[PDB]
Amino acid sequence: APPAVTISASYPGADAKTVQDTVTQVIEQNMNGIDNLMYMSSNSDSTGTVQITLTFESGTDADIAQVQVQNKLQLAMPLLPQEVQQQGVSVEKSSSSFLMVVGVINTDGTMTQEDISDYVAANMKDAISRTSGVGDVQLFGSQYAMRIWMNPNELNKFQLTPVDVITAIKAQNAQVAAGQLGGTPPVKGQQLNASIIAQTRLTSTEEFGKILLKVNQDGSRVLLRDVAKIELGGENYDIIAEFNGQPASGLGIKLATGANALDTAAAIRAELAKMEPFFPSGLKIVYPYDTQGVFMTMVQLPAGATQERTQKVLNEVTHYYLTKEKNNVESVFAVNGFGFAGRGQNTGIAFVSLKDWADRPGEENKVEAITMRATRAFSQIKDAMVFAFNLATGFDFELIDQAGLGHEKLTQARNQLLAEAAKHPDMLTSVRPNGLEDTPQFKIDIDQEKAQALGVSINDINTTLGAAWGGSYVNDFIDRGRVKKVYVMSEAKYRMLPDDIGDWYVRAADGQMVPFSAFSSSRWEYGSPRLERYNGLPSMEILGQAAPGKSTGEAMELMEQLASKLPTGVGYDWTGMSYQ
Amino acid sequence: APPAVTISASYPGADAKTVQDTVTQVIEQNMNGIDNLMYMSSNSDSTGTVQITLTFESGTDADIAQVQVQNKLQLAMPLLPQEVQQQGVSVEKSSSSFLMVVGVINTDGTMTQEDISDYVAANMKDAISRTSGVGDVQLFGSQYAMRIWMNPNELNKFQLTPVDVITAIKAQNAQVAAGQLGGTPPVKGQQLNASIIAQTRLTSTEEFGKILLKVNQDGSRVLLRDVAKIELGGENYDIIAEFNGQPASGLGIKLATGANALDTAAAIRAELAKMEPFFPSGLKIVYPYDTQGVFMTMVQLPAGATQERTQKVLNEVTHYYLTKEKNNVESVFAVNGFGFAGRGQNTGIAFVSLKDWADRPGEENKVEAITMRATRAFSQIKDAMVFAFNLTGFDFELIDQAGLGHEKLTQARNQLLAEAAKHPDMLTSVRPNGLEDTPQFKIDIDQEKAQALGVSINDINTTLGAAWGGSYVNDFIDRGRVKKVYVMSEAKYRMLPDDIGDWYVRAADGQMVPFSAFSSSRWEYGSPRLERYNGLPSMEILGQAAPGKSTGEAMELMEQLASKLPTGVGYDWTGMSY
């Protein structure tokens, strides 16, 4: 398969369009003058994530392709939002699929999913990530951050805002360079030389809680724990894994382009062997997916679907393999919130490991027969594309906006091509979008005239909104000797419903607390939670099959005739399997 | 040899823990996805410096390793403090040993050690650094910066602080893009086009001295020279060198991995021959270490030892070579503050050059016998490891595997060293390669008191840091070359604990508040050098097999001893023992 370099970035709390227009486009515009590049694609998601895939000619030196991609990326880096740069943009040269999954569980049940994911992120991930041949390592879970969960009633009670919280955290969770007594050049004859140690990073919830937000006029103290709950918690809460129904985390490991699979797997095992003797009690590695012996199950709900509804479909999948296929299936490692197209609330994946070849005699107990039955049993689950498979007659079509038509017209055009393809079953089977549909979003308009009149600044309004409802990475702290992030966000119960917008207050220049409702209006509307682009233009990937017996050549040719009738400005290209 | 790529970065006025936790950990966490990395090691030091050494499998293309490293580092640069970014992070692919040293003296004593170092920095170093095969160039000295040496009594008299000084320098030593007259797109009929020139960088102490800090309410002017002494001086003051006891500077040059020693040395000489004709009078190049007719001498004092005590030891070393060995030794180039592996007040190196082999007849006047005699003569110097060596037992890393922390890892190290001392038949000289904790001055800022007085924490921490640690403000042009500008307290107001109380900060209401009103302080211990190994806290232990015993037996015992250490302490073999 052709080599691919992947650029990935993150913008916490950002919607798909914001990601696209502040990040993806700026990078993409620099991706030219790169040798042996066949094509480029990208997704910008409402998880605040962008992933750009640059696919190179077969036989291209991956080291050089990565270098050349990154040198074009450097041109965009100072134009990117500081919140993106700070998350650590990555450029990787891996295979798209997993070589292995390293699972981690706690046999004594003394550690939650959250605890386990933190232990793996903090003590295990980096060393794996540094191992030669490891192209990409995906954490099924999240490293702990220091979480400050703000309460807007308590903030307004003391005339404080998230801006004040963020300011206090930057001032009092600080690592100060303070010099030396008797440092050079000295007064000659100086005997005393000592480093000055001033403020150092906080290391604990207790220290965060005693951050001093203000002194009142009466002399009483407002401390950060008086306006927030304070605990360790995930940088994000989107990825949740289980191993045979038990709380788990893990590492999904992809092979670096051109690296040896056996060698690489072996060095991963060697490195895990260094960690094992220092595990806390109960912790253990399990191996739920070595690359017949194994296969995966993809779970894809429609956009809008919550963690809860995805968990339900995953429970039906897991239940199936542990009840109906229990004589074939050794283990199911199920991950809610991460799937084939990477991350989202409506996606999931199960890695299934089978017992030994010799404890499954009979042709109906082989991977092909098993996956067929599973796919069959899952086919009647509603509002869910669920299927099982172990890793061809298809086509990969890109509908492209070539005239600035915008996302809504491109959808209309896509729908027109999909409806006409539905009237040709003789030539075309299962012609479908690979992407997501638009969903309701809450559109809020800051009234500039009111803000100016009340003396509330727009940066204050935007931070308050963003930090509360999206979260904000403030700075780093030290957790058990390891640098980790600090995030502020509203406690959940204050950021659940439209009316909660009005309970958040911003402080004006004259000291008055002004609720959000005084300078804002809002309405529902639709927009995309995943915007796709192909060769730098807005796009919509359409997948499908040559009908029984007909050539890909003939089905492609039909898709071109249908496409030829679409509105002015809409074009197409072939990618992936269809490129050559 | 396994190729090694080295990252270096600097944070002026930072202690080891600050360096470690805002820089070192952050770079380490982002060295992923690099091919053929065998292991990674680092030091974070109380000089404000970090060195990360990434060692690759043998046979690795050093070009590719360097590039992959630099590319990861680039993606992590935005996570580093602005103070570190702005110093420039370097990444090198070179030997750890010197190929050669270029010495520079003034034969007519016209120029001090400090002038010479600046001349070298400003006129010679960059072209040498751009020569092919030159992997790393160490200046034995510092380039000049514009130094603003602040006086806190005078700052407080005029109700100013270092924040006001820094602000005023950035505003008044500025280089302004001002556009043009008749600039495009122009009006129809425009006849004149000319650049507009506004503020330009300052170029002289005279100019910095007349920076206008403020106009008093009676209309008199407070200039920068009224609160500071203004002089060219080194960006740092840590490295001082001598050639045969005379003031010197120089360049320590390391060969780029894979380069040709002999061709690289020749190209270096060819480049110096371009510079010689334009030297100021007196200035002269000497050649104190050309790599068999040369050797080095190391000087390691215990952490806490000062520039003067290291100097005293170097003088003894130099003296011995210039008196006892004068029939064999042509020269000694001695550097105080640099020590081959590392940089600190407690370390030095001497580069020794011998006379012609032909004129040192006899086995007793060849390198081996000379170094061996010198090591014997220096073995009884107090509280200093001093040894002479031309340029193998074991190399062990004790590792913090469970977030135990510095203090517990030190106790665990000490337990293993004490246990290894009780097997003198199997192990000899089992010792730390690093540094012991030393006293440090812990100052607590009272957040309640600062807020009650209306004193801003940023002004407090900028005041403390700029005064006691130095702050790189922006650039200026010295005789046509871009160089740095630093503010720091004049020496005498930053020597003792009572001096803290003489620094004032201005509150929101205009009152000056001494540091004593909102701080408190105590002595404690901490580390001048924190080590890490493959991303975890670590402590390097060296040692050898006792006589009549194999390396592998000794190693096996170290592993046995190590298996009885407190929970969460692991180990690994590195270096010669990998």
Next chain:
Amino acid sequence: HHHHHHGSDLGKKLLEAARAGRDDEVRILMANGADVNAADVVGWTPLHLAAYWGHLEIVEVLLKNGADVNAYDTLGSTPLHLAAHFGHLEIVEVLLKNGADVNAKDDNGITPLHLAANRGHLEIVEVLLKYGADVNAQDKFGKTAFDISINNGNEDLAEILQ
């Protein structure tokens, strides 16, 4: 009580030995006349060091040989400050048994109770109260051990204090 820093050969050895926990060497040097109150450049005596680094037997040896139980370092702090700050219970007991000033204030007005309180060392807090510690002593910022317990949210300590 501020002992001066003499570059004394046997003083250095003792300071270093007390610091590393070398019990035997401390005994030898004491028999060979070493200044029991040798001070380093920050004013620390071997008792400060033994107290900081938690070397119980050395602390008893130093005291038995006449060490100043109330040595002040250059910022006003005593061996009891250090022991109380760093959780060394048996040392705190031994020091107070030998006449340590339980209400000694450093330059900042900080007492051993303040330090013990700040780091939540509850057993030490009780021992110091037992030995006469002024529970309402205030540092330079007006703060008592009780204020410390409220700021740190240590309810166990607030209760001991009542």
Next chain:
Amino acid sequence: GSDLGKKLLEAARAGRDDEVRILMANGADVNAADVVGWTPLHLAAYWGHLEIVEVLLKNGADVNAYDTLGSTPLHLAAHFGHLEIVEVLLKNGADVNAKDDNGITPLHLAANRGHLEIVEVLLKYGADVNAQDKFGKTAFDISINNGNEDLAEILQ
């Protein structure tokens, strides 16, 4: 005016004494001014060309020509430390207290660059020692601000 006007500006600009004689002889406007209002005497004064200054003055050059910002050849000679030109300009009648649009005099400029020999000649020829620029500053204030003690002596 003239094509030789522009050639003379250029030749005065580049210090070409011989090309300047030949152009004077062929009728070249001696007070030809370029786009910023600089005459050959300005250019020759700024670039230190003494012989050209002399040749031009003998050919009737306006000794007090002012540029679009009010600056005269003596402003330029005084500012750029050209003593022998300052002397000749003043001998041929240069206005010693000429002010530019900013109120700056040749004294202010010589003082600011610490050209002491020039400061003396300007005072010799009647330069007003208390002339203020638009900011209220005298040559004496400029000596204080630059901390140039030698110049402070000379202005008492």
